[PDB]
Amino acid sequence: KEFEQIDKSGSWAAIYQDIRHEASDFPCRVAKLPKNKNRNRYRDVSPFDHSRIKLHQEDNDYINASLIKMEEAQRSYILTQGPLPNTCGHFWEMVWEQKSRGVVMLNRVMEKGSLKCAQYWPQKEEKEMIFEDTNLKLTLISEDIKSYYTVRQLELENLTTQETREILHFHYTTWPDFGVPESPASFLNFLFKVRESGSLSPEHGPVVVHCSAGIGRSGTFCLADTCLLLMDKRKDPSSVDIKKVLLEMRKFRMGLIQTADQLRFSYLAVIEGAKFIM
Numbered sequence: 001k002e003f004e005q006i007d008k009s010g011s012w013a014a015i016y017q018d019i020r021h022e023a024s025d026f027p028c029r030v031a032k033l034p035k036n037k038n039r040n041r042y043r044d045v046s047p048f049d050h051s052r053i054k055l056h057q058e059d060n061d062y063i064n065a066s067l068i069k070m071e072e073a074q075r076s077y078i079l080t081q082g083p084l085p086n087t088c089g090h091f092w093e094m095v096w097e098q099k100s101r102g103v104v105m106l107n108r109v110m111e112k113g114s115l116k117c118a119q120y121w122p123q124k125e126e127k128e129m130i131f132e133d134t135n136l137k138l139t140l141i142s143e144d145i146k147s148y149y150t151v152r153q154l155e156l157e158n159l160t161t162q163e164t165r166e167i168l169h170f171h172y173t174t175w176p177d178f179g180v181p182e183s184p185a186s187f188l189n190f191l192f193k194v195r196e197s198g199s200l201s202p203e204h205g206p207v208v209v210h211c212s213a214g215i216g217r218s219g220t221f222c223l224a225d226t227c228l229l230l231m232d233k234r235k236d237p238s239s240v241d242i243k244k245v246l247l248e249m250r251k252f253r254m255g256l257i258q259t260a261d262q263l264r265f266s267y268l269a270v271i272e273g274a275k276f277i278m
Contacts (some may be wrong), residue, residue: 003267016260019243024251026050036062039090041081044255045213051252053078055090056097057134063090065214066253067206068222073229076206077222079214079253082107082117089131091120092138095167095208096158102199104209105171106217112177116212121154121169135159141166148174148186149193170194175217180261184224184269191225191273200225219256222249224269228277237274242267 006012030036031046039062040046046064047053053065065080078098082105083091095103107116121138122129128139137159143152152169172190174181181187194200199207211217223246230240246266249256257263 003264003271007264012260012264015243016257016263019246019257019263022247023254024247026251028052030062031064033062035060039084039087040064041084042213045081045215047253053080053094053098055093057093063087063094065094065208068249068252070226070249073226073233074202075200075226075229077225078206078208079218079222079256080208080210081214082109082210082212083120085118088118088120088129089134089136091208092131092136092156093134096136096156096165098208099205100167100208101204102168102170102194102197102207104194104199104207104218104221105169105211106175106209106221107211108173108175111212117210121152130159143169148172149190151193151197168197168199170197170199172217180259180265184265184272187220187269188224188273191221191228191269195225213255215253215255216258216262219246219249219253219258220262220266220269223257223266224273227266227270228273231270231274231277235278237278240270242270 006015026048028046029049047066051066053063053067054061055063065078068077068079109115109117109119122140125140128137130137137157139155141153141155143150150171150173154167154169155164156167157164174186209218209221227240227242227245231237
């Protein structure tokens with residue numbers, strides 16, 4: 001209903017306007033520190049100090065990442081920017097330390113003729129990556145390339161202790177160049193694929209999600225997921241408010257969903273995913 005009304009009245013941009021206005025604003029002192037300038041992909045996308053993920057290194061614990069703890073749904077996520085040439089080792093340190101199982105990439109390394117992220121994982125299993133700085137090794141065990149996404153089974157080994165962990169890499173490869181996806185079918189089907197793996201389950205650390213800044217599409221993933229999970233617990237889609245859930249997540253990281261266009265899509269995905277869920 002609400003979705004249909006906003007569409008009829010065309011008030012999407014307005015709706016999004018007010019959400020941006022209602023959004024929480026918190027400090028990002030650490031991020032802004034000069035010694036961290038090169039640890040950030042974008043000027044306008046920073047992790048709030050209260051929720052940033054700290055690296056377990058006595059050196060510099062900065063990594064542009066935020067933990068989003070959704071108490072009600074009982075689900076956490078770690079939103080992050082695509083790792084930079086100089087931060088792929090930090091990215092993996094974080095993954096290891098936070099005991100993450102899955103990694104969700106919602107972007108292509110190159111979109112619109114520009115490199116939106118680093119090739120932080122191996123492409124050929126016969127050539128593994130070793131992150132000197134964080135003393136971690138990464139190996140491609142397998143990958144399944146499909147029409148709209150690719151799953152990769154990587155193995156992350158802590159070179160310090162020789163411990164080995166199986167990380168799953170869910171790569172959404174079909175998000176449009178401009179605009180949002182014409183239909184939620186693939187996104188939801190991708191979400192579901194992420195869910196099935198146990199990557200989102202409580203028995204693991206929070207899933208690391210990222211696009212370029214890790215807020216637009218990453219935000220969409222998390223919003224669709226949480227709302228759907230909430231509609232399950234209460235089993236009442238009538239109480240699950242997309243806008244209220246979004247604002248709740250925005251207390252943890254800025255810019256989740258960056259265009260009213262995307263907002264409408266989150267409504268589409270949630271509404272469409274509720275069909276199976278309900």
